[PDB]
Scaffold this active site. Structure first.
Site, PDB file in Angstrom:
ATOM      1  N   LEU E  41       0.730  -1.231  -0.087  1.00  0.00           N
ATOM      2  CA  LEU E  41      -0.177   0.047   0.028  1.00  0.00           C
ATOM      3  C   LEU E  41       0.702   1.267  -0.024  1.00  0.00           C
ATOM      4  CD1 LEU E  41      -2.610  -1.084   2.615  1.00  0.00           C
ATOM      5  CD2 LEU E  41      -2.938  -0.774   0.041  1.00  0.00           C
ATOM      6  N   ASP E  42       0.168   2.343  -0.432  1.00  0.00           N
ATOM      7  CA  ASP E  42       0.679   3.769  -0.574  1.00  0.00           C
ATOM      8  C   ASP E  42       0.816   4.322   0.820  1.00  0.00           C
ATOM      9  OD1 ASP E  42       1.680   6.105  -1.294  1.00  0.00           O
ATOM     10  OD2 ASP E  42       0.168   6.789  -2.588  1.00  0.00           O
TER      11      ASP E  42
END
Ligand code: CDL
Ligand code: PC1
Ligand code: 3PE
Ligand code: 3PE
Ligand code: 3PE
Ligand code: MYR
Lengths: 122, 79, 62, 55, 87, 65, 155, 459, 128, 171, 165, 177
Positions: E41-42
Site C-alpha cells: 500500500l501507499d
C-alpha cells in the site's frame, strides 16, 4: 405602518406628531361634545389597588374581573367572560384613540387645504 | 464479555448514496475504497429516516384522533 | 420510621419557624409587614361588617 | 426562518463545495469578539502589569 | 455505560475495518500484514487507514505515532496502550 | 435486562421509551389542536382592526370649508 | 545553584555572549538578549514571544499543563503566556480584517440604533386617556392644591 | 490595661522556665488564655471611651486591634514552631521572647492615652520585628529587608517626634482625651503644611503609602512566618490607628493636604493590584495585595467621614485576618517545596483537598465576598469615596476587578491544573496547619454575625 | 489568488506558512540537530533525577530559579537612567497622578461650588 | 409588644371570603392543618415557657440621663464641663439617629402596606420623613468623622449667620 | 435597555447559526432569549419579561438535558457533525427535543407562546426604537434557524457517530 | 519542526501531515458521510496527481502553495476529537490522576484496608529499586560522548534487566481513574 412612511418619507406638517396632539380644540367641529363617563369611583379603584396604568376609563370591568378571579379560586379558568369584557372595553378605548388620531390627521389635511386655498385665492 | 461482531460481507453499498458517489467517481476515473466502511450508516435500522415535517408531526395522528374524540365528547356533553 | 423526612426536615422546622415568627418577630414592630388585602365593591369587612357599596350601573357595551 | 433554514439544510446534502465567505467566518468565530478582546485587552493589561508597574 | 475494550475486541475491530477496505483483499490480511511490504500500500493509504482507526475508536492518533503503525498488531498495541486494556 | 451494546447496527429499544415518546408527542399535538380549537384568537387575532379611512367626517367632526 | 548560573549583566564581548548562551542552555546563534537600553533585563534571552498554546501538545512535555520542558530557558513573560492567559496562536482570519469587521459591525449597529431612535415606530393612536385630571391624586399631587381641569371627551 | 500587660510580661518567665519540650505548649495555652481575657475590652459605650487611667484608655478603635493582637500571638506560635524545630533551645526561647515583647509593645501602643508614649511604643515595635526578620529570616536579603524596614520607618517617624513635642509645647498636652476638647483649627500656612507632613508621613510609611511601600515586598517576604503574620496583620495597622488619632489635630488643613496622597492611593491600589497579576513569588503577591488593601484605608482615613472610618477599621481587622491566613497558606506550601515560586507546585487540590478548601475560603475573603467583613469594609469605603467624589467609583470598581483577578489566579495557579510531576514530597496536611487555617478563618467568618464590634468609635 | 495571511503581534504566523520552514540547507540541519542535542541532554538530565527511587523532593530547575531571579533581583543592577527610562518613568509614574489629580480636583471644586450656592440636590443625603 | 403611637398601623379591613365556585380551595384545609399540627403545639410550648417565666418575675429598667449643661454654657478649654456637654451631645446624636431610623421604618412599612397606591396613600409618612431628614441634615451633616458639639455649634452658628444675613437683605 | 437587548439578541442568535458544538448553540440560544428579555424590559413590560423568565426556564433546562442525554449516549461527544440518525435511536430525547425547540421558537399554545409572542405583540404595538424591533424580528427568525439546525444535524439524517453503539 | 526523536520533519512527512489535516478540515466542511467520501476521493486524486514528482524544488513549491490552499480552505471550527487537544473532554480527568507516590503517604489504618494491594506494591517498589542502578549503568555505557543525541531510550539488552527510565511510563495513571 403606512403612516410611518407618510410621516418620514412624505411631509410631516400634515402628519400628526404622536408626542403632542390634539393640537386642535376638542370642540372644534362638535355640537355639544359630551365627556367620557368614569364608572369606577376613585376610592373604589384606590381600594382595589390597581396599577396606575390600569386606572383608565374602563377599570370597572377590571375590578369585576379581579373580584371574579379572587372568588373563583382555585378554578382559574372560570372568569373568561369578565376578562373578555375588560379586553373588549380596552379595545373600544383603543378604537377611540385611533379615532382621535384620524381626526387630527383629517384636520391637518383641512389646514393644508386651507393654506393652499389661501395661497391660490389671494 | 466476548462480543460478536457481525459479518463484514453484509455491508454492500448498492441501494445507498455511496453507490451514487461511486458512480460519480467512476464517471471521472476514480474508485471508492471506503464505501463498505461507511455502508452501515445507510443500511439496517438507520436507513429511511424521517423528513423534518415528519419529525415535527411525530404523534400527530394519535393527537388528532384524541382531539376529535375530545371535541365530540364536549359537543355531546353540552346537551 | 417511614416518613421521618417529613418530620425532621419539614415539620420540626415549621414548629421552630412558627415559634420564632410568632413570639419573637411579630412581637417587634414592622418586622412582618403584610400588604393590606384588596377591597372590591360588594365586599363585607370581617372586622367591621361594613358592606362596600357596589359599582355604578354600566353603560352596557355589548 | 424554518423555511429558509430547511433550504440551507437541504443544500448540505448536495455535492457542492464552496469556500466559506466572510459572513460565515464572522458568524462562526463569534463575531471576532473573543478573538480580539481576549487577546488584546489582557495583553495591554499584563505588559502594563509587568513592564510599567512592576519593573 | 463505557464498555471495556479488550485486546481481542480491538483486534477484531481493527481487522474488521481493514476487511472493509477495497485496497486490501481480506484473505491475505493477518495481524502482521505490513502495509507497505506485505500488503503493498501507499503511504497515503496508511494515513487513510490510521484516520479510519481514529473514526472507529473515537480518539486521534498523533502523526508522530501515526507514521510508525505499519502492521495491524502495532495499531492494536497502540490502542491498547493508549486505552489501558487488560487491567 | 439492561441494553446490550451493538456494533454498526440499530440499538435495542425498550417498549416503554417508545410508548412514552409517542404518548408525549400525541399529548403535544392534542394540546396544540385543543387550545387552537378553543382560544383561536391568541394566534389569529382577538378583535377586528377597524379601517380609519372608512370613517365619516361627521363622526370625527370635520366641517367642510 | 551558585553564582555563575544566575542572570548577569548585558553581554558585549562574544565570549561573554557565548558564556551567557551556555548558561541559558541554548545555542549562541539562537541567543539574542534584550537591547541594552537599561530596562533591567541584563543577559536574559529574548525568546520569540509566543504563547504556550502554540507548543506541540502531543509532545511529551516535562510540564504537560505548561507545555514546557525542564531546563528549557523560559520566556520573560512565561506567567503571561500560559494557556490560562494571552494566546498568540494563528487565527483563520487576518487580525486587521477582524478588527475592521468588528468595528464596522458595532459602529454600524450603534449608528442604526441612533437612526431608529431619531425615527421611532409607533401606532396610529392618540395619547392614553386617564380620568380624574390625568389621575392627579394618584400620581402624588397634593390635595390642598387643585389641578387645572383635564377633560377628555367621547369620540 | 495593666490586667493585660502583666500576663503578657509573665509570658517571659513562662517561656524561660518551661521544659525543653514544653515551651510551645505552655506559651500557646496561656497566650490563648490572654486572648480569651481580651474580650473584657468590649465594655464600650456609645459616648464615652473605656478610660482606664491617666496612662491607658480603650475606645472602639483600639479594642478590635487589641483583640486581634492578643489573638495573633498563639497563631504565630503555631505557625513558627515547625521551621524552628531543629533550632537551638535558647534561640527558640529568644524567638518566643521577641514575639511576646512585640505583643507587649503593641497592646500598650494601641491603648496609649498620651501621644508621645504612643510614639515610644510605636517605635519600640521596630526592634523585635527587626530582630525576627534579620535573625530568623531564611534568605540573604533579610538583612537588606531589615535595613529598609528600619530606615523608611525612622525617616518617617523622627519628624513625627519633633511635631508631637511641638504639640506638647503649644497645646500643653498630648493626652488624646484632652486634645479632643482643646483642639484648635489648623489654618493654611507653610508651617502648618510641614506640621501636617510631620504628623502624617510616619503613618504613611507604616500603612504603607504607594511610593513609600518599597520596604514591604522585602520585609514581608524575607521574614519568617510569625514575622509576616505580625507585619501584615498588626504592624501595618499602627499607621491607620495613628492616623485616626492624629487627624483630629490636623483640621481643616487636611481637606486640602489629603489631595496628593489620596491620588497616590487611588492610583496606587490600581498599580499594586496589577502588580499582583504578574508576581511569580506567592509571598510577594500577598505583600503587594496588602499594599493594595491598605491604600483603601489610606483614602478612607484621609476623606474623614463616618462611613469611611467605619469601613477603614473594618477593613483593617478583616485584612489582618485574611493576609495572616494567606501568608500561613504560602508557608504551608513553602515547608513542602522549599521555594516561594508560585508556578512550581501546581494542581494541589488533587493532593491536598481540605487545604485547597482553605485556599478557596481565604481567596474569597481576599476578593471581598459578601457578607464577610472584608466586603463590609470594602463596601463602606466605596460608599464614602463615592460621596467624596462620584468619579472615584471607576478607580474603585476597576480595583474590584483586579482584586478578583489576582485572588483566583493565586487559587488557580497553586491549586488547580495538572499537578507537578517531579515534586513528590507533598505530605498530607498536618493537624497543626489545618488548625492554623481554621483559627484564622473561623473568627473571620463569625465576625459577619456581629460586625458592630469591628466598626470603630463612631458606629 | 488567495489572500495572504498577515501576521500580527497577538496572531502569529503559522508554522506551515513560514518560508524558513522548508529549509533543507545543511546549516539549518546543524542548528536543528544541535537544538535536538541540547534538548535531549536536558531531558536526560531531568529524567535521571525524575525516575530516581532514592530522590524524594523537588527536582530543582535552574531555568526556573534563573527566571525568577531575572524577574525579581536582576532588574536594578542592570538599570541605567537614560532618556527612554526617564521619559517612561515620568509618563507612567507621575502622569496618571497629575491626570487623576486634575480630574478629581475639578470635580470636587464643581461639587463644592454647587453645594455652597444651594444648587446641588442634597435632599435626603444624610449618610456620608 | 410595642406602642401603636410611635409605630402606627391603620385598622385592617379584610373582605369576607365569598366563594363563587364549588371547588374547595386547598388554602383553608392547609390553614386548618397549620392550626392543628403547628399553631397549637407551639402555643402549648410557649404557655409552658411562660409559666416558667412567671415562676420568677424580675425586671430591668430604662436608663434616664438627666440634662447636664450643653456646650454653649461651658467655658472654653474647661474639660470638666465640656466633657459632660460632649457626652450629652453624643447621646442626643445617637438618639436622633434612632429617630430617623423609626421614621424610615414608618415610611417603608407604609409603602409595603399600601401596596400599589402607595404614592397617594403615604403622603404623610413621606412628609414627616422629609421634615426629619431636613432637620437631621441641618443638625449633623458634614461635621466629619471627628465631629463634636463644638463642630455642631459652629455649623449652627454659621447657619444662623446665613439666616440673619438673608433676613436682613430681604428687608 | 432596548438597544442593548436588541443588539445582544441579534448578535448571539447570529453567532448560533453556524456553531457546531451543541452546548454552544444552546448557550447562544439562552443569551438570545436574555437579549429578548432585555428588549421587553426596554419597552416598559417588566411582567412580560418575568413571565418569559419563568416560561424560558422549563424548555431551556430541558433542551440542555436532552443535549446531555445525547452527549452521554455518544460517549462525551458534543459536536453536531458526529450525530444524526437519533430520531429512532433516542426516541424520548427526540420527542422532548422537538417539544423544547417548538417551545423555544414559539409554537402556538406551547409555553413559549404565552410570553414571547405577546412580547412581539407588545414590541410591535408601542412607541419603539424601530431598528430594535427590526433586529428583534430578525433574531426571532434566527431562533427558528438554529433550532432546526439542532434538529437537522442531531436527530435527522444519517449517523455520523462512531461504530460501537 | 519539533519532534522528540527526529530533529525535523521530512518533506514526505510534511506531505502526509498536510494530507491528514486537509482531510480532517474537509470532513469539517463536508459534514455528511457520502458527500465527504466523494470530495475525499477527489482530494486523494489531487494528491495522486503530483505523487511522482522528482524535482525537489518543484515538490517543495507545490507543498507550499498546497499549504496556502489549505489555509484558505480551512474550517473556522474544525472537528476536534473530545480527548484531542482543543477537545471538549480534553485533559478533563487530570484532576483525578493522582500519582502513585501518594500511596506511600497513607496512614497504616487505611493501608490495612487493602492488604494484598500494598503487599503487591512492595514488590513493584523493590523491583524498581533493584533495577535502578543496572539501568543507570546501562544508560552511561551506551550514551555517546557529549550527551545523548536524541531523546530515544535503549531497551533492556540483558535478560533480567528492565528498560531504562521505565517507572513513570509504566506507573502512569489510567486515562479513566
Ligand atoms: C455563633 C454560632 C454560629 C453557627 C453558624 C456558623 C457560622 C459560620 C461559621 C464558619 C462556617 C464555615 C466553617 C466550615 C467550612 C470551613 C472548613 C471546611 O471547608 O470544611 C469542609 C467540611 C466538609 O467537607 P468534606 O467533604 O468533609 O471535606 C472538605 C473537602 O476537602 C473540600 O471541601 P469543598 O471545597 O468541597 O467544600 C468547601 C466549601 C466551599 O464552599 C464555597 O466556596 C461556597 C461558599 C461561598 C459561596 C456561597 C455563599 C455566599 C454567602 C452566602 C451565605 C452567608 C449568608 C447566608 C444568610 C442569608 C443571606 C444574608 O465550604 C462550604 O460549603 C462551607 C459552607 C459554609 C460557607 C460559609 C461562607 C464561606 C465563604 C467565604 C466567605 C463568605 C462571606 C462570609 C459569610 C459568613 C457567614 C456567617 O466541613 C466540616 O467538616 C465542618 C467543620 C466544622 C465547622 C464548624 C463551623 C463553626 C466554626 C466556629 C466555631 C465557634 C462557634 C460555634 C459554632 C458551631 C456551629 C456548629
Ligand atoms: C520617609 C521619608 C520622608 C519623611 C517625610 C517626613 C515629613 C516631611 C516634612 C518634615 C519637615 C520637618 C519637621 C517639621 C516639624 C513641624 C513642626 C512645626 O511646628 O512646624 C512649624 C514650624 C514653624 O515655626 P514655629 O512654630 O516655631 O513658629 C511660630 C509660628 N509662626 C511660623 C507663625 C511664627 O516650622 C518650622 O520651624 C520649620 C518646618 C519645616 C522644616 C524644614 C526642614 C526639613 C525638610 C523636610 C525633611 C524631610 C525628611 C528628610 C529625610 C528623608 C530621608 C533621609
Ligand atoms: C451598559 C454598558 C455596557 C458596556 C459594554 C462594553 C464595555 C466593556 C467592554 C469589554 C471589556 C471586557 C472584555 C475584555 C477582557 C476580557 C478578558 C477575558 O475574559 O479574557 C479571556 C482570556 C482567555 O480566554 P479565551 O482565550 O477566550 O479562552 C479560549 C479557551 N482557551 O483570559 C485571559 O487572558 C486572562 C486574563 C487575566 C487578566 C485580565 C486583565 C484585563 C482586565 C480588564 C478589566 C477591564 C475593566 C473595565 C472597567 C470599566 C469601569 C467602568
Ligand atoms: C515618591 C514617593 C511617593 C510620594 C511620597 C510623598 C512625598 C511628597 C509629600 C508632599 C506632597 C506635596 C505637599 C502637599 C500639597 C498640598 C497642597 C499644597 O500645598 O499645594 C502646593 C502649593 C499650593 O499653593 P498654595 O496652596 O497657594 O500655598 C500657599 C499656602 N499658604 O503649591 C505651591 O505653592 C507651589 C509649589 C511650592 C513648593 C512646595 C514644596 C514643598 C512640598 C513638597 C515637598
Ligand atoms: C530627562 C532625561 O532625558 O534624563 C536623561 C538622563 C540621562 O541622559 P542619557 O540619556 O543617559 O544621555 O537621566 C537623568 O538625568 C536621570 C533621571 C532624570 C530625572 C527623571 C525624573 C522622573 C523619574 C521617574 C519618576 C517616577 C515616579
Ligand atoms: C407600519 O408599517 C406600522 C408597523 C410598524 C413599523 C413596520 C414594522 C415592520 C416589521 C413588522 C412586519 C413584518 C412583516 C413580514
Amino acid at each position: 405602518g403606512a403612516h410611518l412612511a407618510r410621516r418620514y418619507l412624505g411631509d410631516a406638517s400634515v402628519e400628526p406628531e404622536p408626542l403632542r396632539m390634539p393640537t386642535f380644540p376638542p370642540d372644534y367641529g362638535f355640537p355639544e361634545r359630551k365627556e367620557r363617563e368614569m364608572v369606577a369611583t376613585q376610592q373604589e379603584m384606590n381600594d382595589a389597588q390597581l396599577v396606575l396604568q390600569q386606572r383608565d376609563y374602563c377599570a370597572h370591568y377590571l375590578i369585576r374581573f379581579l373580584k371574579c378571579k379572587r372568588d373563583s379560586f382555585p378554578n382559574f379558568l372560570a372568569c373568561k367572560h369578565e376578562q373578555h369584557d375588560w379586553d373588549y372595553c380596552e379595545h373600544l378605548d383603543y378604537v377611540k384613540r385611533m379615532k382621535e388620531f384620524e381626526r387630527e390627521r383629517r384636520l391637518l389635511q383641512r389646514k393644508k387645504r386651507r393654506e393652499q386655498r389661501e395661497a391660490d385665492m389671494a | 464479555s466476548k462480543m460478536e461482531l457481525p459479518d463484514y460481507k453484509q455491508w454492500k453499498i448498492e441501494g445507498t448514496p455511496l453507490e451514487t458517489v461511486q458512480e460519480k467517481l467512476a464517471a471521472r476515473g476514480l474508485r471508492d475504497p471506503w464505501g463498505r466502511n461507511e455502508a452501515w450508516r445507510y443500511m439496517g435500522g438507520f436507513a429511511n429516516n424521517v423528513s423534518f415535517v415528519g419529525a415535527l408531526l411525530k404523534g400527530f395522528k394519535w393527537g388528532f384522533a384524541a382531539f376529535v374524540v375530545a371535541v365530540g365528547a364536549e359537543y355531546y356533553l353540552e346537551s | 420510621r417511614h416518613s421521618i423526612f417529613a418530620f425532621t426536615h419539614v415539620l420540626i422546622p415549621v414548629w421552630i419557624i412558627h415559634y420564632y415568627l410568632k413570639y419573637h418577630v411579630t412581637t417587634k414592630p414592622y418586622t412582618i409587614v403584610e400588604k393590606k388585602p384588596r377591597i372590591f365593591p360588594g365586599d363585607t369587612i370581617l372586622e367591621t361588617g361594613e358592606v362596600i357599596p357596589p359599582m355604578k350601573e354600566f353603560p352596557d357595551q355589548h | 426562518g424554518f423555511i429558509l433554514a430547511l433550504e440551507i439544510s437541504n443544500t448540505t446534502h448536495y455535492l457542492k463545495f464552496n469556500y466559506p465567505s466572510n459572513t460565515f467566518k464572522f458568524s462562526n468565530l463569534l463575531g471576532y469578539y473573543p478573538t480580539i478582546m481576549h487577546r488584546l485587552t489582557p495583553y495591554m493589561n499584563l505588559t502594563m502589569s509587568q513592564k510599567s508597574a512592576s519593573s | 455505560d463505557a464498555p471495556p475494550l479488550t485486546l481481542e475486541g480491538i483486534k477484531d475491530r481493527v481487522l474488521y475495518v481493514l476487511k472493509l477496505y477495497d485496497k486490501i483483499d481480506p484473505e491475505k490480511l493477518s495481524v502482521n500484514s505490513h502495509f507497505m511490504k506485505d500488503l503493498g500500500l501507499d503511504s497515503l493509504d496508511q494515513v487513510e487507514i490510521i484516520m479510519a482507526m481514529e473514526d472507529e475508536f473515537g480518539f486521534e492518533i498523533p502523526d508522530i505515532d501515526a507514521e510508525k503503525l505499519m502492521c495491524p498488531q502495532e495499531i492494536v498495541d497502540y490502542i491498547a496502550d493508549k486505552k489501558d486494556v487488560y487491567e | 435486562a439492561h441494553i446490550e451494546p451493538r456494533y454498526r447496527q440499530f440499538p435495542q429499544l425498550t417498549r416503554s421509551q417508545v410508548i412514552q415518546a409517542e404518548f408525549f408527542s400525541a399529548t403535544m399535538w392534542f394540546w396544540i389542536l385543543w387550545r387552537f380549537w378553543h382560544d383561536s384568537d391568541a394566534v389569529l387575532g382577538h378583535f377586528p382592526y377597524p379601517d380609519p379611512s372608512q370613517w365619516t367626517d361627521e363622526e370625527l367632526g370635520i366641517p367642510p370649508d | 545553584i551558585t553564582k555563575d548560573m544566575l542572570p548577569g549583566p548585558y553581554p558585549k564581548t562574544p565570549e561573554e555572549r557565548a558564556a551567557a548562551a551556555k548558561k541559558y542552555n541554548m545555542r549562541v546563534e539562537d541567543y539574542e538578549p534584550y537591547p541594552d537600553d537599561g530596562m533591567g533585563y541584563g543577559d536574559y534571552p529574548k525568546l520569540p514571544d509566543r504563547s504556550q498554546q502554540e507548543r506541540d501538545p502531543w509532545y511529551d512535555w516535562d510540564h504537560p499543563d505548561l507545555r514546557l520542558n525542564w531546563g528549557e530557558p523560559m520566556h520573560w513573560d512565561l506567567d503571561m503566556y500560559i494557556r490560562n492567559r494571552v494566546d498568540t496562536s494563528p487565527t483563520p482570519v487576518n487580525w486587521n480584517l477582524m478588527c475592521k469587521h468588528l468595528f464596522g459591525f458595532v459602529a454600524f449597529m450603534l449608528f442604526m440604533f441612533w437612526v431608529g431612535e431619531t425615527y421611532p415606530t409607533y401606532q396610529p393612536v392618540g395619547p392614553k386617556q386617564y380620568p380624574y385630571n390625568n389621575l392627579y391624586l394618584e400620581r402624588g399631587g397634593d390635595p390642598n392644591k387643585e389641578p387645572e381641569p383635564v377633560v377628555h371627551y367621547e369620540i | 490595661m495593666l490586667k493585660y500587660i502583666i500576663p503578657t510580661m509573665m509570658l517571659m518567665p513562662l517561656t524561660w522556665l518551661s521544659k525543653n519540650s514544653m515551651i510551645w505548649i505552655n506559651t500557646t495555652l496561656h497566650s490563648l488564655l490572654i486572648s480569651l481575657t481580651s474580650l473584657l475590652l468590649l465594655n464600650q459605650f456609645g459616648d464615652n471611651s473605656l478610660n482606664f487611667s491617666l496612662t491607658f484608655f480603650s475606645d472602639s478603635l483600639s479594642t478590635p486591634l487589641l483583640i486581634l493582637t492578643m489573638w495573633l500571638l498563639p497563631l504565630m506560635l503555631m505557625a513558627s514552631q515547625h521551621h524552628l524545630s531543629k533550632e537551638n533551645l535558647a534561640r527558640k526561647k529568644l524567638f518566643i521572647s521577641m514575639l511576646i515583647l512585640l505583643q507587649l509593645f503593641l497592646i500598650m501602643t494601641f491603648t496609649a492615652t498620651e501621644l508621645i508614649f504612643f510614639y515610644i511604643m510605636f517605635e519600640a515595635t521596630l526592634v523585635p520585628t527587626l530582630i525576627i526578620i534579620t535573625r530568623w529570616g531564611n534568605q540573604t536579603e533579610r538583612l537588606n529587608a531589615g535595613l529598609y524596614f528600619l530606615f523608611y520607618t525612622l525617616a518617617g517617624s523622627l519628624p513625627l517626634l519633633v511635631a508631637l513635642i511641638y504639640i506638647q509645647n503649644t497645646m500643653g498636652s498630648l493626652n488624646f482625651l484632652i486634645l479632643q476638647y482643646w483642639v484648635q483649627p489648623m489654618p493654611n500656612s507653610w508651617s502648618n503644611t510641614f506640621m501636617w507632613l510631620a504628623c502624617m508621613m510616619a503613618f504613611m510609611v507604616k500603612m504603607p503609602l504607594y511610593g513609600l511601600h518599597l520596604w514591604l515586598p522585602k520585609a514581608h517576604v524575607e521574614a519568617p512566618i510569625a514575622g509576616s503574620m505580625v507585619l501584615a496583620a498588626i504592624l501595618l495597622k499602627l499607621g491607620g490607628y495613628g492616623m485616626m488619632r492624629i487627624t483630629l489635630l490636623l483640621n481643616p488643613i487636611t481637606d486640602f493636604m489629603a489631595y496628593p496622597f489620596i491620588m497616590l492611593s487611588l492610583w496606587g491600589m490600581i498599580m499594586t493590584s496589577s502588580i499582583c497579576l504578574r508576581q511569580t513569588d506567592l509571598k510577594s503577591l500577598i505583600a503587594y495585595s496588602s499594599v493594595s488593601h491598605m491604600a483603601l484605608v489610606i483614602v478612607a482615613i484621609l476623606i474623614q467621614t463616618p462611613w469611611s472610618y467605619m469601613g477603614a477599621t473594618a477593613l483593617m481587622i478583616a485584612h489582618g485576618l485574611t493576609s495572616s491566613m494567606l501568608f500561613c497558606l504560602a508557608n504551608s506550601n513553602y515547608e513542602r517545596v522549599h521555594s516561594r515560586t508560585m508556578i512550581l507546585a501546581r494542581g494541589l487540590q488533587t493532593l491536598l483537598p481540605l487545604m485547597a478548601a482553605w485556599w478557596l475560603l481565604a481567596s474569597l475573603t481576599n476578593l471581598a465576598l459578601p457578607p464577610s467583613i472584608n466586603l463590609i469594609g470594602e463596601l463602606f469605603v466605596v460608599m464614602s469615596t463615592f460621596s467624596w467624589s462620584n468619579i472615584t467609583i471607576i478607580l474603585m470598581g476597576l480595583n474590584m476587578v483586579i482584586t478578583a483577578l489576582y485572588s483566583l489566579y493565586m487559587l488557580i495557579t497553586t491549586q488547580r491544573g495538572k499537578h507537578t510531576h517531579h515534586i513528590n514530597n507533598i505530605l498530607p496536611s498536618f493537624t497543626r496547619e489545618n488548625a492554623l487555617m481554621s483559627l484564622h478563618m473561623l473568627p473571620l467568618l463569625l465576625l459577619s454575625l456581629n460586625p458592630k464590634i469591628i466598626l470603630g468609635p463612631l458606629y | 489568488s488567495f489572500p495572504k495571511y498577515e501576521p500580527s503581534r497577538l496572531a502569529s504566523l503559522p508554522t506551515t506558512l513560514d518560508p524558513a520552514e522548508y529549509d533543507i540547507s545543511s546549516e539549518t540541519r546543524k542548528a536543528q540537530a544541535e537544538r535536538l542535542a541540547i534538548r535531549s541532554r536536558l531531558k536526560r538530565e531531568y529524567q535521571l533525577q525524575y525516575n530516581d527511587p532514592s530522590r524524594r523532593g523537588v527536582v530543582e530547575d535552574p531555568a526556573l530559579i534563573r527566571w525568577t531571579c531575572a524577574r525579581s533581583a536582576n532588574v536594578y543592577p542592570n538599570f541605567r537612567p537614560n532618556t527612554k527610562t526617564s521619559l517612561l518613568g515620568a509618563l507612567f509614574g507621575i502622569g496618571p497622578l497629575i491626570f487623576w489629580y486634575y480630574v478629581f480636583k475639578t470635580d470636587r471644586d464643581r461639587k463644592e461650588k454647587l453645594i455652597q450656592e444651594g444648587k446641588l440636590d442634597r435632599t435626603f443625603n444624610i449618610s456620608y | 409588644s410595642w406602642d401603636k403611637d410611635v409605630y402606627p398601623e391603620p385598622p385592617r379591613r379584610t373582605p369576607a371570603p365569598s366563594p363563587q365556585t364549588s371547588l374547595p380551595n386547598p388554602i383553608t384545609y392547609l390553614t386548618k392543618a397549620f392550626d392543628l399540627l403547628v399553631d397549637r403545639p407551639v402555643t402549648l410550648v410557649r404557655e409552658f415557657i411562660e409559666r416558667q417565666h412567671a415562676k420568677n418575675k424580675y425586671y430591668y429598667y430604662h436608663r434616664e440621663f438627666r440634662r447636664v449643661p450643653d456646650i454653649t454654657e461651658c467655658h472654653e478649654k474647661d474639660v470638666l464641663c465640656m466633657f459632660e456637654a460632649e457626652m450629652q451631645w453624643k447621646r442626643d446624636y445617637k438618639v436622633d439617629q434612632e429617630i430617623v431610623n423609626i421614621i424610615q421604618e414608618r415610611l417603608k412599612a407604609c409603602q409595603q402596606r399600601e401596596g400599589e397606591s402607595h404614592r397617594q396613600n403615604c403622603a404623610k409618612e413621606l412628609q414627616q420623613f422629609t421634615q426629619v431628614v431636613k432637620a437631621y441634615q441641618d443638625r449633623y451633616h458634614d461635621l466629619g468623622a471627628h465631629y463634636s458639639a463644638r463642630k455642631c455649634l459652629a455649623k449652627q452658628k454659621q447657619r444662623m449667620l446665613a439666616e440673619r444675613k438673608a433676613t436682613k437683605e430681604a428687608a | 435597555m432596548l438597544c442593548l437587548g436588541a443588539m445582544t439578541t441579534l448578535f448571539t442568535a447570529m453567532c448560533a447559526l453556524t456553531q457546531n458544538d451543541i452546548k454552544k448553540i444552546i448557550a447562544f440560544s439562552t443569551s438570545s432569549q436574555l437579549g429578548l428579555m432585555m428588549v421587553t424590559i426596554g419597552i416598559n413590560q417588566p411582567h412580560l419579561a418575568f413571565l418569559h423568565i419563568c416560561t424560558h426556564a422549563f424548555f431551556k433546562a430541558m433542551l440542555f438535558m436532552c443535549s446531555g442525554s445525547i452527549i452521554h449516549s455518544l460517549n462525551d461527544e458534543q459536536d453536531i457533525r458526529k450525530m444524526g440518525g437519533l430520531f429512532k435511536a433516542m426516541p424520548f430525547t427526540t420527542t422532548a427535543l422537538i417539544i423544547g425547540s417548538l417551545a423555544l421558537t414559539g409554537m402556538p399554545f406551547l409555553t413559549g407562546f404565552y410570553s414571547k409572542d405577546l412580547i412581539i405583540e407588545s414590541a410591535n404595538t408601542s412607541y419603539t426604537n424601530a431598528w430594535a424591533l427590526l433586529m428583534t424580528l430578525v433574531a426571532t427568525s434566527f431562533t427558528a434557524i438554529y433550532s432546526t439546525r439542532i434538529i437537522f444535524f442531531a436527530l435527522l439524517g444519517q449517523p455520523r457517530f462512531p461504530t460501537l453503539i | 519542526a519539533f519532534l522528540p526523536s527526529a530533529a525535523y520533519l521530512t518533506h514526505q512527512q510534511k506531505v502526509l501531515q498536510l494530507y491528514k489535516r486537509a482531510l480532517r478540515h474537509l470532513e469539517s466542511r463536508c459534514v455528511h458521510r457520502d458527500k465527504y467520501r466523494y470530495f475525499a476521493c477527489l482530494l486523494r486524486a489531487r494528491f495522486d496527481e503530483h505523487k511522482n514528482e522528482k524535482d525537489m524544488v518543484k515538490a517543495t513549491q507545490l507543498l507550499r502553495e498546497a499549504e496556502k490552499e489549505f489555509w484558505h480552505g480551512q474550517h473556522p471550527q474544525p472537528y476536534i476529537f473530545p480527548e484531542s487537544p482543543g477537545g471538549t473532554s480534553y485533559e478533563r480527568y487530570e484532576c483525578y490522576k493522582v500519582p502513585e507516590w501518594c500511596l506511600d503517604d497513607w496512614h497504616p489504618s487505611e493501608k490495612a484496608m487493602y492488604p494484598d494491594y500494598f503487599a503487591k506494591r512492595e514488590q513493584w517498589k523493590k523491583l524498581r529499586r533493584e533495577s535502578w542502578e543496572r539501568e543507570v549503568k546501562q544508560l552511561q555505557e551506551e550514551t555517546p560522548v557529549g550527551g545523548p543525541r536524541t531523546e530515544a531510550l535503549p531497551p533492556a539488552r540483558k535478560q533480567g534487566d528492565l528498560p531504562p527510565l521505565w517507572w513513570h511510563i509504566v506507573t502512569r495513571p489510567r486515562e479513566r481513574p
